[PDB]
């Protein structure tokens, strides 16, 4: 459908906002990132493609923390994701200043959804070219959400985005089938690494670095922390072992 | 005035006299100083009547807006909203507030917000002009986790002395009992508490 | 000024005197101090005469527009909220002390608003210089379950106490009775206990007593 | 939003303002208005375009307006746009009286409106006013003055001018019969004769006519003719 | 195509052409090379002149005693970004008495550059920057792009023919990353890298520009006779 | 200190039998110094008369304001403003500046062209409509006029008898006020005509 | 120039095409809903489609609790539905603050419909492609259904349906009201009204329902609430019990 | 993010016509018919209420609305525009006139304010004209009963009787034959119903038809007693029962 | 501080003191406290140190701008009405102009002289003879005694000599004489032998 896709706020005769649909095409080109909701927290994993050996390992972090209990991972236009996360940090700080409590994840997800959606209202602005998997632990459990360029978001047992989303979603579905009682935080980290490695088979042309993050009540006391050192290497070893 | 809030085993009781004075004249002798800012969050107002009423109206609007968006607030959140208004306008609004509320997880909570705009969580709180005369009595007699009957008897004794010694305090004693069973309103007339 | 409101078993009655003073001088001997905010919501104002007239006229405009917007009979609470929020916004510079009374689909109401934006609910109220004199009568004679006649007599008697005992109150008694089921009846000059007596002599000057320099006809 | 902008305030490749030319074309389809300046007064006459037996001619004042106790204007083009300018003209006339305690000179009032019309023609991106005015007024300096202004913001002084439909025919007729030493009563005839010839209807009748005069107590009066008064002069003038 | 007229339009394939065109402006600029060891970070910039009657336009800009950057593309945009970077480094010192971290400095540029790629009225910065600095975490090197993407690297090159220098750095990565406490040996490595990007010219005293920052070395720029020994 | 007492002056309005009377003194001064004996304080906007007392700068400012407002009213309405409508126009205009108020006390007087009944109304400096059926007073000598008008005035005075009453009330009140005097002007307003008269009075 | 189809301005036929296209956006979720009024309650029944196994069904809701007494079911894209819900929640709270009493459902429909009109006149703002159905039990009017559409139009309803199969549901409601000759469902409790609404949703759509296929909101005096999956299951059991 | 439509979307075409005004007037022509008739002692404004669905409570959607107690308006064209435009008219009736002069505006001045609102949309940047034509009927002590039509362009004219909307041409022809300067209000209502009966295609009863009149003051609708100078609204809606009674005698 | 003005049959005579005093000493004894607003309109002013000249020169620019714009000289009535409005605007502004002015002009259309006294509040009054501040306390008794509308310019100047002599005799301050200007049908001229 041409003619109606040159502007951001225009409905096509079918009611479809094409520019937002084109923004989704930007997301589908990004590196695959997933989020797994465990029985007491959430786990985030992102594939970081190694463009060249000259990138210093472990410095180009792509998972972001908001306040202290929300972690955000996104795929698509990385600058757009940072713009969205910068707003979330402002929204989270504003909520804490006025209400004194850390912003609830369902409340935070709405704050971001209103912002992302507001970018589809006017033709003087462009839609976000990122789908953001975000979540954390709040007063009433763990929450995992996923935004879209249109501003739509839902709660997920496990979310996947980026180029390997179709591959990753297959293994996320297997996790919920095999573990309906709830997956443990430590096992979720190992499974998160395995899913990213499997999803990378859609990007075999280039090497990648796995980055994991997670926020569990029992293990981080409800705060968002990165996987590093021994725990990261066990996940990498497990992911390679299953691949081999 | 004389406002008071006492946590007890099943929840929290807010209490106050009913007299408001403009000098020696009692402008209204049956005032209701207990204000509902949310279903199970109530506040006691002392100081300027215009300022406290304005703050209570704005806080109720904020907590109503909070509930529609982020679920039911806690008593700590209600006190936080009070602090921002009382603190960000401390040079204009001469308001001292006692916020008491009930929620299932934390049971009864009491927050006092003195004239400065700071927030203090307390087992029991007393404010108003008449409170100064019962600082010693309340401290000696307050106990943790008293029953509803003991707390009401404790509050009746406390306010009867605050009413006795303060000219700017008197009238009927109005209580609001916040518990899991709901909100209960009690009133005690001078013939009931004056000869305790 | 003397103003009283008396809630009775099926409505509310507000009364006021009709004397307006500029210091010790009586500028208006028959000022109407009861103002409409809507057909069945009425306001009586003490303190500055201009602000009470002006504040009610502004709120009365907004009540009418809001009533047309919502297609509903105005609430006395809406008048109270917009009235107190307006007064609070000006931090007491608008020296309007008001008794707002009326009937709405939710019953009969009687509030008093102070110049600083504070409000109180009551079954009988009084404002003005004669408030203490009027409240003495209200305290002595008010009772639960007053009939319309008892309330009108009590309200008028309370105003009379201010008229006789307060220098700032006098002349006549204005009464407005708002009952839940029927229209508000404005009893202008309900009682006129201060009718002036005949003068001892007639001061009709004989024509030509005044000296005139020039006479002219003015075009309209 | 840049794609939807029509670029109102731009020059044509041959140095013309497109929207002002189109606004003038709009005015050429409006009812004719005629102004004639006589030795002892000014005559403003206009032809109502919208007409029906159910239209209230008695109070349908839509082309002749009073700006002051001394100035009036006849309007051709968008009636809605004119009333916006009419009210600013009235306010300006009172602002001048408030400041200088004298009645505003006609040229000063005309210049202010023409400056308002020109503003929409050069900046702001909004469409021009589609109204032409004929100002008839009096002041101590120049006496009886007759001006006309158009959407472009240009204004000129005239002895007899017509705006609206059939200006070419109306102007030619005025050229043939206008005598400098003529009285108002002759201007009453000339205005009606000119309209009766350039009117697009079969005949000219009192229901189609707006008519006003400015004439000299030794003080200038404004008379906006009521329908019965117009009907009287139409018989006297022989139309 | 009609999807490249403004910066607020996605193409049917999800591409922002106006940003791609800004990236093309960098490829027209002269090659500038960046590399670092654990102790020192070095910028080597090839400077170009309009005519042999003209001076060579400067490529290295100093933001602090501990931070600086080289540019490729629209020099006026570099001044806008370098001035903004100075203010952020300035703000950190005044308000915190804290040297702005190079990583944090890069993210501040990323946030500023992105704003022009999402709202109408502005344009992407048609300049790529190599930011080097030394802070309490060691030497750093960042590559900034008009799209807002900022990458921390061992070494890199931007500008015309930068692929040759970039390819050399990849082969030599195992070597120059170990040059600790020997500033002049890094500069030789960088100069040898940028020499791989020369097409029809040779480095000269006036053509070449070098900068270095490290543990004890404040950000210093070598131009003219100063770089005579490295050529 | 008090702006309303700097320039002095007084205005009085009385009602009769199908006629209104409005009168004022002609003194303008600077406290003790009398500057002008021709400073008229009564202005008409058609068939409605406005007498403004108080600060002379505010009296002049409001005259040009109400001329501005009433002139625009007659262009939009195509009819002259009636005394009752004008009374609210004055009231709102004075309140529009509650916190920057004009130090003036106006007195509206006129006969409604349609109903034909006399009308007079008074005001404070911030616009309290003091509508009276008998008489209105303003200015420095309001105390004197109140007692003087309250005794002489009687209902339903003929236009000839009303002139004697209002003029005598004005002259005797002005004679006992330091800042008022230097001649007075009386308007006798009837449904069909208006008569303007200048009174002989003490020039000290 | 084809401006008329891209911004809210009149076309040569006098039509606002962008508003017409916003109506098409409402049906893109393929969710059907209906609202009925009882004697003292209002019930909103909405289809709940969760084809994705990774979704959390608890969060897939198109019914919003605007106020304590007012509820709203939206038809159309969720991002726009949440935009209207947040604005409605802000409007209702502001109304209570300014005017001292809870906002009536009809006033909120009017307030939200006036906003939709502004988007339909200003070229800056696009219409929201959502249809908002406000339900409550007003303090004066009793049970109330008010449906707003992207054009800025709104009206009260005896019972209303929305979605692709709106016509099919409406005829069933039309016939039922024709035979009963009354303006409301004559039941004293909302459990029977919910069972009534679910039965005609089943009949009109001709599909069996499970507890996960429905999302139900009930408006009563002084409270609007949404039924949980377990509460909806009880209603489904009763329907299968023929009573 | 900012509002970037600071330019006018209504502009003169090479033929001199304003495209958006003409299209706005077209939307009125497909609008539901409405008419007004001015009688010697009142004005009657009528229209038919076509319902979106039989389940819609048409009583909740009033096409005839009160602007001031003595002024009422009916529309033809786009319903939403009339609703917001009426809200503006009621507001400006207070802010611009009543709050200054203490009394409600006359019909001529209120129509001018409404016309100014419509004209502003015809020249201001980033807006389209209102797609409604209003028939505003009112009374004032100096001009008496008056009936005005306001167009999307902001132009307004006074009418003895008029009809706007789908059947305007047929209605206006009918009104010309029937209208005369001797009509009483009871006769105008009879003529209004007869004219409206021709336009309506479906059911013709009190529920599908909406009438309002400006006539004698209704002190029973005033809501209070004791102020003789207050005499009550002159604008009155005829309830469905009242219309149905007159239909039986039609 | 002396500002006097007398309107005679054919002209207006404005006299203003020459002294300028700043605190302890007299800075200047030849100051001209007047501005020519138009060829036939003259404005004398007195008041606070800086306000008098800033206001007078600001007024003169607007009157000059009007004259060039319409190629027409404002009448003295219009100029005084304009000047009064600015003083009225300022008296209730952030920093009022504390300036008292006399506006004497010749109306070439009515062929009559005009004298207007406006104080810093904005109180415009037309007088046969005017004065500002305490200068009118000493002079009005003489002017009330000797003034007649039909005086010639020579008689008017003789009357100003009496008014100035009385000011010299009884007023404590030394105002260093007066500069006298006459606004006539022929324009504005200064009397040097006074």
Residue A159 belongs to domain with CATH number: 3.60.20.10
Q: Give A-chain residues touching B71 at CB under 8 angstroms.
A: 104
Q: What 3 state SS string does B30-43 have?
A: CCCCEEEEECCEEE
- Cα–Cα nearest to C71, from F160, I95, H86: H86
Do I and A make contact via 3 or more CB pairs under 8 A? The reply is no
Judge residue H140's burial from the number of C-beta atoms within 10 Å of its C-beta, 0-12 exposed, 13-18 middle, 19 or more buried: buried
The reply to whether C208 falls in a domain is no
**Cα torsion angle, C72, C73, C75, C78, sign:** positive
Q: What 3 state SS string does chain E have?
A: CCCCCCCCCCCCCCCCHHHHHHHHHHHHCCCEEEEECCCEEEEEEECCCCCCCCCCCCCEEECCCCEEEEEEECHHHHHHHHHHHHHHHHHHHHHHCCCCCHHHHHHHHHHHHHHCCCECCCCCCCEEEEEEEEECCEEEEEEECCCCCEEEECEEEECCCHHHHHHHHHHCHHHHCCCCCCHHHHHHHHHHHHHHHCCCCCCCCCCEEEEEEECCCCCEEEEHHHHCCCC
Closest in H100, H112, H141 to F92, CB measured: H100
Q: Is there a catalytic annotation at residue A32?
A: no
The DSSP line for A85-128 is HHHHHHHHHHHHHHHSSPPPHHHHHHHHHHHHHHTTT-TTB---
F14 CB neighbour count, 10 Å cutoff: 30
Q: Which residues contact D91 (CB under 8 A, 6 or more apart)?
A: F72
**Helix C76-89 crosses helix C49-70 at what angle (to 10 degrees)?**
130
| Interface mutation vs chain C, best among H91, H226, H235, most C CBs within 10 Å | H226
Which chains sit next to G, with 3 or more Cβ pairs under 8 A?
Answer: A, B, C, D, H
The DSSP line for D128-157 is PP-EEEEEEEEETTTEEEEEEE-TTS-EEE
User: Residues 100 to 159 of H: which have CB under 8 A from any D CB?
Assistant: 108, 112, 115-116, 118-119, 122-126, 143, 146-147, 153-155, 157-159
At residue G11, what are phi and psi to the nearest 5 degrees?
-90, 170
Nearest residue on chain D to F76, judged by CA atoms? D87
I67 touches chain D (CB under 8 A): no
> Do A114 and G117 touch, CB atoms closer than 8 A?
no
For chain E, the distance separating the N- and C-terminal CA atoms, rounded to the nearest angstrom, is: 46
Q: Give C-chain residues touching H110 at CB under 8 angstroms.
A: none
Joined together, the tokens standing for residue E99 give 């040297």
> Do D153 and D114 touch, CB atoms closer than 8 A?
yes
F202 CB neighbour count, 10 Å cutoff: 10
Tokens 């007899």, located at residue:
D160
- Cα–Cα nearest to G68, from G131, G139, G130: G139
Taking each continuous run of H as one helix and of E as one strand, the counts in chain F are: 4, 12
F161 touches chain C (CB under 8 A): yes
Chain H residues near any Cβ of chain G (below 8 Å): 3-5, 9, 20, 23-30, 52-61, 78-81, 83-84, 87, 121, 126-131
CB-based contact C114 B30, cutoff 8 Å: no
Chain H residues near any Cβ of chain A (below 8 Å): 1-2, 4
The boundaries of the domain holding residue H215 are 19-249
Please give the Cα distance from C64 to C81 (Å, whole number).
15
Please give the Cα distance from E90 to E86 (Å, whole number).
6
CB-based contact D1 H159, cutoff 8 Å: no
Do F and E make contact via 3 or more CB pairs under 8 A? The reply is no
Please give the Cα distance from F184 to B186 (Å, whole number).
72
> Do C130 and C163 touch, CB atoms closer than 8 A?
yes
Joined together, the tokens standing for residue F130 give 């003091």
Joined together, the tokens standing for residue H217 give 């003051």
Please give the Cα distance from A111 to A96 (Å, whole number).
13
Q: Which residues contact H93 (CB under 8 A, 6 or more apart)?
A: H67, H68, H71, H104, H105, H110, H113
Angle at the Cα of G140 (from G136 to G145), degrees rounded to 5? 30
To 10 degrees, the CA torsion angle through G70, G75, G76, G79?
A: 30
Please give the Cα distance from F13 to F20 (Å, whole number).
7
Q: Give H-chain residues touching D60 at CB under 8 angstroms.
A: 157-158
> Do B101 and B41 touch, CB atoms closer than 8 A?
yes
B:G CB pairs within 8 Å:
21
At residue H140, what are phi and psi to the nearest 5 degrees?
-150, 155
**Cα torsion angle, A65, A67, A68, A69, sign:** negative
CB-based contact B81 A99, cutoff 8 Å: yes
| Interface mutation vs chain D, best among I76, I81, I87, most D CBs within 10 Å | I81
Q: Give H-chain residues touching G112 at CB under 8 angstroms.
A: none
DSSP lists the bridge partners of residue B178 as B12, B183
- Cα–Cα nearest to C103, from C80, C124, C74: C74
Judge residue H38's burial from the number of C-beta atoms within 10 Å of its C-beta, 0-12 exposed, 13-18 middle, 19 or more buried: buried
Strands H224-225 and C184-191, bridge-based pairing: parallel
Nearest residue on chain I to D140, judged by CA atoms? I109
**Cα torsion angle, H207, H210, H211, H217, sign:** positive
CB-based contact C122 B25, cutoff 8 Å: no
Please give the Cα distance from B123 to B144 (Å, whole number).
8
Nearest residue on chain H to C185, judged by CA atoms? H225
Specify the 3-state DSSP secondary structure of A28.
coil
> Do C58 and C121 touch, CB atoms closer than 8 A?
no
Nearest residue on chain I to D141, judged by CA atoms? I72
Joined together, the tokens standing for residue H65 give 């609305």
Experimental method: cryo-EM
Q: Give D-chain residues touching F75 at CB under 8 angstroms.
A: 66-67, 90
For chain B, the distance separating the N- and C-terminal CA atoms, rounded to the nearest angstrom, is: 20
CB-based contact G67 B68, cutoff 8 Å: yes
Q: Which residues contact G221 (CB under 8 A, 6 or more apart)?
A: G40, G137
- Cα–Cα nearest to A63, from A75, A53, A71, A55: A71
The reply to whether H223 falls in a domain is yes
Please give the Cα distance from C106 to C108 (Å, whole number).
7
Q: What 3 state SS string does chain I have?
A: CCEEEEECCCCEEEEEECCEEECCEEEECCCCCEEEEECCEEEEEEECCCHHHHHHHHHHHHHHHHHHHHCCCCCHHHHHHHHHHHHHHHHCCCCCCCEEEEEEEEECCCCEEEEEEECCCCCEEECCEEECCCHHHHHHHHHHHHCCCCCCHHHHHHHHHHHHHHHHHHCCCCCCCEEEEEEECCEEEEECCC
The DSSP line for B34-86 is EEEEETTEEEEEEE-HHHHHHHHHHHHHHHHHHHHHH-SPPHHHHHHHHHHHH
Residue C172 belongs to domain with CATH number: 3.60.20.10
Please give the Cα distance from A13 to A1 (Å, whole number).
9
Alpha carbon A9 to its chain's center: 26
- Domains: count for chain G: 1
Q: Which residues contact E202 (CB under 8 A, 6 or more apart)?
A: none
Please give the Cα distance from F42 to C57 (Å, whole number).
29
The reply to whether C218 falls in a domain is no
Chain A residues near any Cβ of chain H (below 8 Å): 118, 122, 124-125
Please give the Cα distance from B44 to B162 (Å, whole number).
16
Q: Which domains does chain D have, with CATH numbers?
A: 11-237 (3.60.20.10)
Q: Which residues contact E8 (CB under 8 A, 6 or more apart)?
A: A8, A123, A124, A125, A126, E118, E119, E120
Specify the 3-state DSSP secondary structure of H167.
coil
> Do D97 and F68 touch, CB atoms closer than 8 A?
yes
**Helix G105-121 crosses helix H79-92 at what angle (to 10 degrees)?**
100
The reply to whether A171 falls in a domain is yes
Closest in D66, D69, D94 to F68, CB measured: D94
CB-based contact G89 B57, cutoff 8 Å: no
Please give the Cα distance from F79 to F71 (Å, whole number).
10
Q: Give H-chain residues touching C183 at CB under 8 angstroms.
A: 222-225
Specify the 3-state DSSP secondary structure of H108.
helix
I78 touches chain F (CB under 8 A): no
> What is the arrangement of strands in the sheet containing H209-214, beginning at the earlier edge strand?
H161-164, H34-39, H42-48, H209-214, H235-238
> Do I47 and I40 touch, CB atoms closer than 8 A?
no
Nearest residue on chain B to C125, judged by CA atoms? B28
> Do C108 and C7 touch, CB atoms closer than 8 A?
yes
> Do A134 and A109 touch, CB atoms closer than 8 A?
yes
- Cα–Cα nearest to C167, from C43, C44, C23, C46: C23
Rg of chain I (C-alpha set) = 16
B:C CB pairs within 8 Å:
29
CB-based contact A25 E2, cutoff 8 Å: no
Q: Give C-chain residues touching B92 at CB under 8 angstroms.
A: 91
Rg of chain C (C-alpha set) = 20
Alpha carbon F88 to its chain's center: 16
What is the residue extent of each domain of chain I? 1-194
A124 touches chain D (CB under 8 A): yes
The boundaries of the domain holding residue G147 are 1-243
Closest in B74, B76, B81 to A98, CB measured: B81
Chain A residues near any Cβ of chain E (below 8 Å): 5-8, 19, 22-29, 51-56, 59-60, 77-80, 82-83, 86, 119, 123-127, 129
The boundaries of the domain holding residue C159 are 3-191
CB-based contact B64 G93, cutoff 8 Å: yes
CB-based contact I81 D141, cutoff 8 Å: no
Q: Give H-chain residues touching C68 at CB under 8 angstroms.
A: 66, 90
CB-based contact E120 A125, cutoff 8 Å: yes
- Cα–Cα nearest to I36, from I178, I194, I181: I181
Longest dimension (CA), chain D: 62
CB-based contact D4 G7, cutoff 8 Å: yes
Joined together, the tokens standing for residue C39 give 């057909």
User: Residues 78 to 107 of G: which have CB under 8 A from any B CB?
Assistant: 86, 89-90, 92-94, 96-97
Specify the 3-state DSSP secondary structure of G4.
coil
- Domains: count for chain C: 1
Q: Give A-chain residues touching H1 at CB under 8 angstroms.
A: 118, 122, 124-125
Q: Give G-chain residues touching C77 at CB under 8 angstroms.
A: 99-101
């Amino acid at each position: 459908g041409t003619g109606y896709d040159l502007s951001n706020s225009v409905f096509s005769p079918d009611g479809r906002n094409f520019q937002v649909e084109y923004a989704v095409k930007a997301v589908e080109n990004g590196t695959t990132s997933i989020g797994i909701k465990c029985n007491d927290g959430v786990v985030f994993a992102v594939e970081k493609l190694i463009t060249s050996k000259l990138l210093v390992p472990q410095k180009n972090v792509k998972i972001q923390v908001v306040d202290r209990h929300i972690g955000c991972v996104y795929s698509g236009l990385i600058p757009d994701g940072r713009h969205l996360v910068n707003r979330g940090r402002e929204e989270a700080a504003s909520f804490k200043k006025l209400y004194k409590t850390p912003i609830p994840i369902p409340a935070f997800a709405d704050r971001l959804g209103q912002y992302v959606q507001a970018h589809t209202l006017y033709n003087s602005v462009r839609p976000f070219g990122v789908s953001t998997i975000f979540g954390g632990v709040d007063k009433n459990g763990a929450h995992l959400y996923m935004l879209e360029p249109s501003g739509s978001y839902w709660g997920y047992k496990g979310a996947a985005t980026g180029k390997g989303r179709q591959s990753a979603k297959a293994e996320l579905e297997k996790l919920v089938d095999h573990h309906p009682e709830g997956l443990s935080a430590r096992e979720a980290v190992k499974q998160a690494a395995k899913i990213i490695y499997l999803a990378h088979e859609d990007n075999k042309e280039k090497d990648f670095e796995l980055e994991i993050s997670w926020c569990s009540l029992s293990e981080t006391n409800g705060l968002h922390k990165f996987v590093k050192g021994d725990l990261l290497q066990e996940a990498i070893d497990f992911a390679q072992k299953e691949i081999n | 005035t004389s406002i008071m809030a006492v946590t007890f085993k099943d929840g929290v009781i807010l209490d106050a006299d009913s007299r408001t004075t403009t000098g020696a004249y009692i402008a209204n002798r049956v005032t209701d100083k207990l204000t509902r800012v949310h279903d199970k969050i109530w506040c006691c107002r002392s100081g300027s009547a215009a300022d406290t009423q304005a703050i209570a109206d704005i806080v109720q609007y904020h907590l109503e807006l909070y509930t529609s968006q982020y679920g039911t607030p806690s008593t700590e959140t209600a006190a936080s909203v009070f602090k921002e208004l009382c603190y960000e306008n401390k040079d204009n609004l001469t308001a001292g507030i006692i916020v008491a509320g009930y929620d299932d997880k934390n049971k009864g909570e009491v927050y006092t917000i003195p004239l400065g705009g700071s927030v203090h969580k307390l087992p029991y709180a007393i404010a108003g002009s008449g409170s100064t005369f019962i600082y010693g009595y309340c401290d000696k007699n307050f106990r943790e986790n008293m029953s509803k009957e003991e707390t009401v008897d404790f509050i009746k004794h406390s306010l009867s002395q605050a009413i006795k010694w303060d000219g700017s305090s008197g009238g009927v004693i109005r209580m609001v009992v916040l518990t899991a069973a709901g909100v209960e309103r009690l009133i005690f007339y001078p013939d009931e508490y004056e000869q305790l | 000024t003397t103003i009283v409101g008396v809630k009775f078993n099926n409505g509310v009655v507000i009364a006021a005197d009709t004397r307006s003073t500029q210091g010790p001088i009586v500028a208006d001997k028959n000022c109407a101090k009861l103002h409409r905010i809507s057909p069945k919501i009425w306001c009586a104002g003490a303190g500055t005469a201009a602000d009470t007239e002006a504040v009610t006229q502004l709120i009365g405009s907004n009540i009418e527009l809001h009533s047309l917007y919502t297609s509903r009979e105005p609430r006395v609470v809406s008048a109270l909220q917009m009235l107190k929020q307006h007064l609070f916004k000006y931090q007491g510079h608008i020296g309007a002390y008001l008794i707002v009374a009326g009937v709405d689909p939710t019953g009969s109401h009687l509030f008093s608003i102070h110049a600083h934006g504070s409000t109180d609910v009551g079954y009988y109220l009084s404002l003005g210089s004669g408030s203490l004199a009027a409240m003495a009568v209200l305290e002595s004679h008010w009772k639960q379950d007053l009939t319309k006649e008892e309330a009108i007599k009590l309200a008028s008697d309370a105003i009379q106490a201010g008229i006789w005992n307060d220098l700032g109150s006098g002349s006549n008694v204005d009464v407005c009775v708002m009952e839940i089921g029927k229209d508000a009846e404005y009893l202008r000059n309900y009682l006129t206990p201060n009718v002036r007596e005949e003068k001892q002599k007639s001061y009709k000057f004989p024509r030509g007593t005044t000296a005139v320099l020039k006479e002219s006809i003015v075009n309209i | 939003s840049r794609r939807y902008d029509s670029r109102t305030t731009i020059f044509s490749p041959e140095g013309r303002l497109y929207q002002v030319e189109y606004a003038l074309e709009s005015i050429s389809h409006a009812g004719t208005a005629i102004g004639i300046m006589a030795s002892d007064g000014i005559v403003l006459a206009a032809e109502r375009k919208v007409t029906s037996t159910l239209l209230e001619q008695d109070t349908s004042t839509e082309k002749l307006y009073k700006l002051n106790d001394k100035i009036a204007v006849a309007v051709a083009g968008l009636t809605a746009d004119a009333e916006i300018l009419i009210n600013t003209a009235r306010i300006h006339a009172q602002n001048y009286l408030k400041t200088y305690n004298e009645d505003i000179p006609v040229e000063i009032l005309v210049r202010r409106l023409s400056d308002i019309k020109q503003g929409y023609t050069q900046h702001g991106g909004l469409r021009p006013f589609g109204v032409s005015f004929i100002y008839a007024g009096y002041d101590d300096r120049y006496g009886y003055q007759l001006y006309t202004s158009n959407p472009s913001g240009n204004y000129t002084g005239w002895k007899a001018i017509s705006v609206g439909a059939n200006t070419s025919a109306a102007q030619t007729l005025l050229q043939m019969d206008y005598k400098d030493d003529m009285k108002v009563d002759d201007a009453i005839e000339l205005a009606l004769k000119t309209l009766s010839k350039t009117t697009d209807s079969s005949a000219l009748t009192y229901d189609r006519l707006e008519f006003a005069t400015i004439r000299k107590d030794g003080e200038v009066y404004q008379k906006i003719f009521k329908p019965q008064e117009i009907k009287d002069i139409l018989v006297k003038t022989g139309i | 195509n009609n999807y490249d007229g403004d910066t607020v339009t996605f193409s049917p394939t999800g591409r922002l052409f106006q940003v791609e065109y800004a990236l093309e402006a960098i490829k027209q600029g002269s090659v500038t090379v960046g590399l670092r060891s654990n102790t020192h970070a070095v910028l080597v910039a090839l400077k170009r002149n309009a005519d042999e009657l003209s001076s060579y336009q400067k490529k290295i800009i100093k933001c602090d005693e501990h931070m600086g950057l080289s540019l490729a593309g629209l020099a006026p945009d570099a001044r806008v970004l370098s001035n903004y970077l100075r203010q952020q480094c300035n703000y950190s010192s005044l308000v915190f008495n804290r040297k702005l971290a190079v990583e944090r400095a890069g993210h501040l540029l990323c946030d500023k550059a992105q704003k022009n790629t999402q709202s109408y009225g502005g344009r992407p910065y048609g300049v790529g920057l190599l930011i080097i600095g030394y802070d309490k975490s060691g030497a750093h090197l960042l590559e900034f792009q008009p799209s807002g993407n900022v990458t921390e690297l061992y070494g890199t090159a931007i500008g015309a023919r930068s692929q040759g220098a970039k390819t050399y750095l990849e082969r030599t990565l195992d070597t120059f990353i170990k040059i600790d406490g020997n500033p002049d040996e890094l500069i030789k490595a960088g100069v040898e890298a940028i020499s791989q990007s020369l097409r029809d010219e040779s480095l000269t005293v006036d053509n070449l520009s070098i900068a270095i920052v490290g543990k004890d070395t404040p950000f210093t720029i070598y131009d003219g006779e100063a770089v005579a020994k490295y050529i | 200190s008090d702006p309303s007492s700097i320039n002095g002056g007084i205005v009085v309005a009385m009602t009769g039998k199908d006629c209104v009377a409005i009168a004022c003194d002609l003194r303008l001064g600077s406290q003790s110094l009398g500057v002008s004996n021709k400073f008229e304080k009564i202005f008409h906007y058609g068939h409605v008369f406005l007498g403004i007392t108080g600060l002379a700068t505010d009296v002049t400012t409001l005259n040009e304001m109400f001329r501005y407002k009433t002139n625009l009213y007659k262009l939009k309405e195509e009819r002259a403003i009636e005394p009752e409508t004008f009374t609210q126009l004055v009231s709102s205009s004075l309140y529009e500046r509650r916190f920057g108020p004009y130090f003036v006390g106006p007195v509206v007087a006129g006969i409604n062209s349609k109903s034909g009944k006399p009308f007079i109304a008074g005001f404070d400096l911030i616009g309290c409509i003091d509508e009276a059926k008998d008489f209105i007073v303003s200015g420095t000598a309001s105390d004197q006029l109140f007692g003087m008008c309250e005794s002489l005035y009687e209902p339903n005075l003929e236009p000839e008898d009303l002139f004697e009453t209002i003029s005598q009330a004005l002259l005797n009140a002005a004679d006992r006020d330091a800042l008022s005097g230097w001649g007075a002007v009386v308007y006798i307003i009837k449904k069909d005509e208006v008569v303007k008269r200048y009174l002989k009075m003490r020039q000290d | 120039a084809g401006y008329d189809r891209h911004i809210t301005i009149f076309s040569p036929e006098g039509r606002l095409y962008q508003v017409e296209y916003a109506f098409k956006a409402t049906n893109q979720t393929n969710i059907n809903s209906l609202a009925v009024r009882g004697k003292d309650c209002t019930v909103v029944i909405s289809q709940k489609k969760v084809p994705d196994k990774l979704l959390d069904p608890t969060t897939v809701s198109y019914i919003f609790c605007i106020s304590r007494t007012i509820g709203m079911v939206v038809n159309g894209p969720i991002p726009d539905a949440r935009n209207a819900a947040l604005r409605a929640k802000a409007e209702a709270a502001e109304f209570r603050y300014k005017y001292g009493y809870d906002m009536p459902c009809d006033v909120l429909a009017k307030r939200m419909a006036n906003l939709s009109q502004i988007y339909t006149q200003r070229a800056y703002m696009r219409p929201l492609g959502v249809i908002l159905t406000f339900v409550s039990v007003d303090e004066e009017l009793g049970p109330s259904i008010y449906k707003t559409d992207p054009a800025g139009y709104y009206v009260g309803y005896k019972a209303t349906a929305t979605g692709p199969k709106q016509q099919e549901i409406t005829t069933n409601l039309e016939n039922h009201f024709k035979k009963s000759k009354i303006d409301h469902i004559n039941e004293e409790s909302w459990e029977k009204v919910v069972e009534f609404a679910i039965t005609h949703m089943i009949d009109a759509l001709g599909t069996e329902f499970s507890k996960n296929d429905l999302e139900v909101g009930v408006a009563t005096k002084d409270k609007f609430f949404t039924l949980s999956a377990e509460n909806i299951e009880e209603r489904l059991v009763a329907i299968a019990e023929q009573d | 993010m900012t509002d970037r439509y600071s330019f006018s979307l209504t502009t003169f075409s090479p033929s001199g016509k304003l495209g958006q005004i003409d299209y706005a007037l077209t939307a009125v022509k497909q609008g539901v018919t409405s008419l007004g008739i001015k009688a010697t002692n009142g004005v009657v404004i009528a229209t038919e209420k076509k319902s979106s669905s039989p389940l819609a409570m048409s009583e909740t959607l009033s096409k005839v609305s009160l602007l001031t107690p003595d002024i009422g308006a009916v529309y033809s064209g786009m319903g939403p525009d009339y609703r917001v435009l009426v809200d503006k008219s009621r507001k400006v009736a207070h802010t611009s006139y009543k709050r200054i002069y203490g009394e409600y505006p006359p019909t001529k001045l209120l129509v001018s304010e409404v016309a100014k609102i419509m004209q502003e949309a015809t020249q201001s940047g980033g807006v389209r004209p209102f797609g409604v034509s209003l028939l505003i009927a009112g009374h004032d002590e100096f001009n008496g009963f008056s009936l005005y039509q306001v167009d999307p362009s902001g132009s307004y004219f006074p009418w003895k009787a008029t009809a706007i909307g789908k059947g305007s041409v047929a209605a206006k022809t009918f009104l010309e034959k029937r209208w005369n300067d001797e009509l009483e209000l009871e006769d105008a209502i009879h003529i209004a119903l007869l004219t409206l009966k021709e336009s309506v295609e479906g059911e013709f009863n009190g529920d599908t038809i909406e009438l309002a009149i400006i006539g004698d003051e209704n002190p029973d609708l005033l809501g209070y007693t004791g102020i003789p100078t207050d005499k009550g609204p002159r604008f009155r809606k005829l309830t469905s029962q009242e219309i149905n009674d007159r239909l039986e005698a039609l | 501080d002396i500002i006097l003005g007398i309107r005679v049959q054919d002209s207006v005579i404005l006299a203003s003191s020459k002294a300028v005093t700043r605190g302890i000493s007299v800075l200047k004894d030849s100051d001209d406290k007047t501005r020519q607003l138009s060829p036939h309109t003259l404005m004398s002013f007195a008041g606070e140190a800086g306000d008098t000249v800033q206001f007078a020169e600001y007024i003169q620019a607007n009157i000059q701008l009007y004259s060039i714009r319409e190629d027409y000289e404002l009448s003295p009535q219009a100029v005084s009405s304009f000047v009064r409005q600015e003083l009225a605007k300022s008296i209730r502004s952030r920093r009022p102009y504390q300036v008292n002015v006399l506006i004497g002009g010749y109306d070439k259309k009515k062929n009559k002289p005009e004298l207007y006294q406006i104080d810093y509040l904005g109180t415009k009054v037309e007088l046969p003879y005017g004065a500002h501040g305490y200068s009118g306390f000493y002079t009005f008794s003489l002017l009330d005694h000797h003034y007649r509308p039909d005086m010639t310019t020579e008689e008017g100047l003789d009357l100003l000599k009496l008014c100035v002599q009385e000011l010299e005799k009884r007023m404590p301050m030394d105002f260093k004489g007066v500069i006298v200007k006459i606004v006539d049908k022929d324009g504005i001229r200064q009397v040097d032998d006074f």
